Amino acid sequence: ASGQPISLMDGKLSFSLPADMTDQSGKLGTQANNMHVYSDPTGQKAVIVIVGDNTDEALPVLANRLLEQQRSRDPQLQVVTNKSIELKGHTLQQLDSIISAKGQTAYSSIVLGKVDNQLLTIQVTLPADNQQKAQTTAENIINTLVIK
Template sequence: MRHITHYMGIFLVVLGLAACDQKKDDPQAQHHDQSASQSQHQNISLLDGKLTFSLPQGMSDQTGKLGTESNNMHVYANNNGQQAVIVIIGDETALTLPQLSQKLQDQQRNRDPQLQVVADKSITLGHTPGQQLDSVVSTNNHSNWSTVVLAKLNNQLVTLQISLPADNQSQSQSIASEIVQSIVIH
């Protein structure tokens, strides 16, 4: 659990960096990019193909900048860092996924008393059970949509953290949902 806390700290740094970059893109260019990217996804395969998922176009591998494969953390983000997906392959744990989700909520609430939990539910990732925690996290007067997916692969905890701007919550929720629906653990 200590490693999850460490990685959550890194996740909050990414959120903070995204919050600091309050740059608003050109709405017309953004609309054009959204319609073009909805049909294009890039497929990601980790752990020798045991974990696969798709990312929206525009996100690229930032692992060398914010994480390393040697510490089992992979980071994908768009150019301005406002959209990020962090994948953490953790240690073995005996805790259940709902217990881990509750611990995560408690940790987030300690950092952000205004945390809004939208959903905490069981999901299936291929044939593997998972837990999905959706919330709105506030950092530096800026809100981000956060979806955290927890699963176990050979008793190791696999965590996917999806962070998107909450300006348009329904759009962020939709993007996060597409990513979650594409996750398969083999």
């Protein structure tokens, strides 16, 4: 099954993907202004950073929405962490989960923040074949975060 056709380059470029593949920006309906992608050579370890317009919706509520989106795709979703974290005056929300689809398993660590009147989303996804190693790697990345 392919998904709906995708149009890019103001309609000049179009294609179709397997139906399970979806746009990684706009998952919260907010318009993304900036996106950055870091990955290993295989793309299986990835960090996506999105900066978009602010929303009035509280960060725990956004986190709960992302959790529900994940659970709609994966009825066995594991929630590892769903909590507030403090970075120098800023409350951020961290949602860690083990997501399974079609024999792929990932450890996902999402941090949400409201920074300089913008919604900041950081999504870490790592192969979770070794669940403990993936968890450690994600936590280690999150530990490095600094807001100036």
